[PDB]
Each structure stands twice: as C-alpha cells, then as structure tokens.
C-alpha cells in the first residue's frame, strides 16, 4: 500500500526523467536534455545532477509535485533507487545527490513552524561564522570478534553504533562492534550558521540565529558576509540543555504490560529545528 | 511437534568383536542378549531460564544432544545474569 | 653428527630392502622376495609387512644388526619414513608397522633388568586375564579457537594435551586445545597381562606378573590360556604408587640461575617397567 505509493511515486519519476523534457524548437535548448546531463556527467564523472523543480511543475498537472514536497525525507531512497537503474540502463562506486532548485515562494527564518517539517523551503538570509571541514562515517563494517567481522551495514542515519540483529556470526543480540577505521566510505561536510536579514525585522527586536548543514557538493561555496538561498529538507537535532524551561516535557517510559514476571532505562527528550541544505547559490 | 522415524533392514550384521576404529560415527546393526539396566529418568529438552536479576522469564531453546549447556547473558544488557532453570514450563524426555 | 647417524643408518636400510633378498636358485623361493611382499600387500590392501632378522644378519657381517637391536625406540621415524620413500617410488592414508620376528635367544622374566633398556628381547610367557579393545589418539587437531583451528600436530609420544608453541594464531604461548573429536586417525589397542611360565621359576619362590601392550595388527590374536612369543621394545611407564618404598627417590627442581628477580613447580618420578609388542605368535 505505502510501499505501492513509494513504488508507484518511483516509477512515475523514472517515467519522467525517461521521456522528453525540452519542449523548445529548433531554436533553442534542442532535445531532450537530461541524457546531455548524464552523458556530460559521464565525460567529466563528477557524480551529481542538478535538476528543476519548474520542469515538474509542468508535466503531471501537480499531482506528483504535491507528493514530493510535503514528505521528502520519507522519499530519498526510492529515488535515488529509481535513478541508479536509469544509470545502469545508459552508464557504466557511486553516490548520488538530488538537489532541487528554482522554487515559488521564498520564506524567511520567521515563518519557520512546525506543522512544516519533512517538507522543502526556500531560506534567504546571511552567512556569519563559517566552520571547518571534517568527515563523517555512513558506511560501517562493524560485527562482532567471534567470529565474522565483515557486515557492511546501517548508521546511514546518526545514531551511531551499532549493528543490532543477525548477529554476529554468532554471537547473537546484541553482540556488536568493535567498528573498522579503514573499511568504510567517507564523504565530508560543515557547518555553517546562518543569521538574519537586516532589512527584514519586525520593529522592534533582535536578529535571530538559525543552523545549517552542507553535505557534498556545497562544501566551501558558502562566503563570511554574503547572502545565500538554500534547500529545504529541515530535520530534526536532538537538544540537551532545554531543562528546566518549564515543561511539561514528554518522557518515554517503556511498556510492560507484556512480559510476564516470575530496570527503569526511561529517557528524555527535548528537540530543536536546525537545517538541512544541499544546493548553494550566492546571488545576493 | 516431532516424528523421529525408524530404519529397519540394514544388511551387514557384526555379532560383536569387529568393532574398531573405523566404524565411529557409522551405522551399525548389532545381536545380543540384554543384562541388567537401571529405571526410567528424565532428560531435559526444551529449556526456559529466568534472570532473578531483570524480573522474568527469557525464552525455549533446544539443547542438545548432547552438550546441556550454557546460555550465558542477554535482555538485560548482557549482565548479571546468574540464571536458574527452573522445575516449571520446561519439557523433559526420557532416558534409559 | 647424530642425524647423520641416524640418516646414515637410514639410507643403509633402503639400500638392504631395496636389493636382492633371496640366495637360493631356481628351485626355490625365487627372487627377490620383498617386492612380492609390497605388491602382494598392494592387491589386499592390508597395511603392514613382515621383514626377517635373520636376512638382516646375513648381509652388512652384523654391522647394521648392531645398530638397530641397541636403539630401537630412537630409530622408528627414520625407519617409517625411508620404507615410505621406497613405496612411493613403487606403489601408489599409510600407516606402516615394521614388526621383526625369528630372533637368536629368547630371555625369561627374571632375566630382565634396566639395562636392556630400548633393546630388542624375546619374552615367553603365559596369557592370563586378556582386556578388551579401545581407541587412542595420537593424531592431534588442537588449537585455540582465537582464531585458527586446524593445526596437525603432536601427542604421539603420550602426554597427551597439548600443543605448545606457534600459537594461536594469534593467541601465543601457551594458549591451546580446545581439541577436535572428529577430525583425526584412530587405531585400537587392548592390555593382556602375561604372568610366568610354570615350568621355570626358581624353587622355590611364587609367579611373577609383567604388563604388556599391543597395538594395531596383533589385537585379538592374544588367548587366555596359551603360551605365546613376542617383542621386544620394552618401554617405561610412569606409576605414581610407590611411595614410602623407602627411597632416596629423586625430584626435579628447575633451575633459577637464569632469571634475574627484581612458583615451586616442582614434581615427582617413579617408573615401572612394562612392555610393549607388536607380534604375536601363538606356538607353545
């Protein structure tokens, strides 16, 4: 069902990036172009596409342009699926980066709530305080010394460690890691911090601080002291020092009424909205 | 649960005395007249420890023929589970 | 010096199986007559050989026969191993036993004492109270399960556990067994346990026992209630009952005058002579 429409969103998106997408005559922009962006991409092997969102805009009459931009982080990996067979049906290690752009309408670190998570916004505001460059792990290769240590696996999302199930051969759950510090694929990314508008404000406050994180292609094309529109995916960070505020906060105390008997490892959480961009532009 | 089967006519019948060291892990048909035995005892099949530590029970295992042993930690991060069979919900087999 | 000794004894042996063994003509017994003797094993497939000492005594004027009889226990690998080379240079899973028979002067019990020690001996006796028959080992897979378990190895000789160096890999010494049920080359042995001709003991004193150990193709062939022929090799088990004799019995205090400081593994030894043979023949 949910399955079927991720599958079937996927398999329109194939359908659409198949077909033509220059509707311009002779005089232009000739046909088709995306295979020119492949192919070029080929020449070159550089391992990224910059696609329109106008493009999309026009074709599916916004059925399927309401379907990518409410719940986008539910749908990375169907597509960057759907676009690895298009790859191996017209291409010859690989790491793929969807990074939209061209979008309506631009909102600002005011209109920022919550009932927007998950979906994609277009965020203008000022570069202050740029940080350094350092790697992060995504790939890991960790199982258990008894015996087999070979496991290429999770941690894709940041948890980090470790492997959970079918473990390990065998030392069952939840024998994990030790991890392997030569065995993985490495990619880098910063973090800057974006501040706000000067001609924006509402009279009379301060300006406000809003985090944000490269990925990728934009490392490095941000500028100390210079305007910026970002990309929209907007997830959530886990936050430690918001106690105390006053609440009341949730807690998460596990459930009990199964097990049947013959400790309390209930936690916190507390969380705030940082940012997720991938497409740097500097025009300001 | 379990059928274990029978076979009956296998044909090389050794009487005694021409057992050496090449028939281990065989199969072999043997003659003879029964002596003394002892009574009938049961062996443990199916096998459900309890954690006095972290409250409740854990879970069946099957084991074994013939090992009996010795399943060490887990469902309480791995620790400290001196563990106790207990005389309830485990199913025994007989042995003679 | 000693291995050339030892090797010099050897490559002598291959050369005297190796050449003719038969001096009668045509009317005979015809020549050779050991190759018969490989080659009749190789349509049967039964594994063993009888060589005569007394061709041994023809041929090198008593030389070789000096040589053989005195340290018979040093020399069973050099033996083992150049009659190997002879059958891999004439015959295409070998375990080879070289059991001597027809020897000059057959020798009572109380003619035993402790120097004739590793020789060859004729003892006649009586069989009473015959055991039954047993595996044993001496074919080791033994090492430590961090990580490689596959080693061929020692407990020939019995120790019997276990093996020493070139540990693991990688767990060094004395990190070991484990051992293996399964993967390795049995052979079967009983115990009969000889006791004294009647018609010999000197008037007038009582029967003497002696122990007695047989291995491989002279299982079975013992009779309770029969006079019987055997061989010589005459090894030392260790006994641990002979305690408050009194002695003085000895003890073997390592030594310290190495190790410079900045425990007391000591032990004990008593023997008693048993015997060990290999052919049986049941004539009396």
Known sequence: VDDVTGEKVREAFEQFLEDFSVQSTDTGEVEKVYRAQIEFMKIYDLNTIYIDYQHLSMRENGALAMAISEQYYRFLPFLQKGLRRVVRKYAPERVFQISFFNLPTVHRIRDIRSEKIGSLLSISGTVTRTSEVRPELYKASFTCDMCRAIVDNV?????????????????????????????????????????????????????????????????????????????????????????????????????????????????????????????????? | ??????????????????????????????????????????????????????????????????????????????????????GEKTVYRNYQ
């Open chain 1, 155 to 284: 941690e894709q999302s940041f948890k980090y460690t470790e492997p959970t199930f079918c473990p390990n051969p065998s030392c069952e759950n939840r024998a994990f890691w030790t991890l392997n510090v030569t065995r993985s694929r490495f990619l880098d990314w910063q973090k800057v911090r974006i501040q706000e508008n000067a001609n924006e404000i509402p009279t009379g406050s301060m300006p406000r601080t809003l985090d944000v994180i490269l990925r990728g292609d934009s490392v490095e094309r941000a500028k100390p002291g210079d305007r910026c529109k970002f990309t929209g995916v907007e997830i959530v960070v886990p936050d430690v020092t918001q106690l105390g505020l006053p609440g009341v906060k949730p807690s998460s105390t596990l459930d009990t009424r199964g097990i049947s008997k013959t400790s309390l490892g209930v936690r916190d959480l507390t969380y705030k909205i940082s940012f997720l961009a991938c497409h740097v532009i500097s025009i300001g």
């Open chain 2, 1 to 86: 649960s379990e059928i274990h089967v029978r076979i009956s006519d296998f044909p090389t019948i050794y009487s005694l005395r021409e057992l050496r060291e090449s028939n281990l892990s065989s199969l072999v048909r043997v003659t003879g007249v029964v002596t003394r035995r002892t009574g009938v005892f049961p062996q443990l099949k199916y096998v459900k420890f309890n954690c006095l530590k972290c409250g409740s029970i854990l879970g069946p295992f099957f084991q074994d023929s013939n090992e009996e042993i010795r399943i060490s930690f887990c469902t309480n991060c791995k620790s400290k589970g001196p563990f106790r069979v207990n």
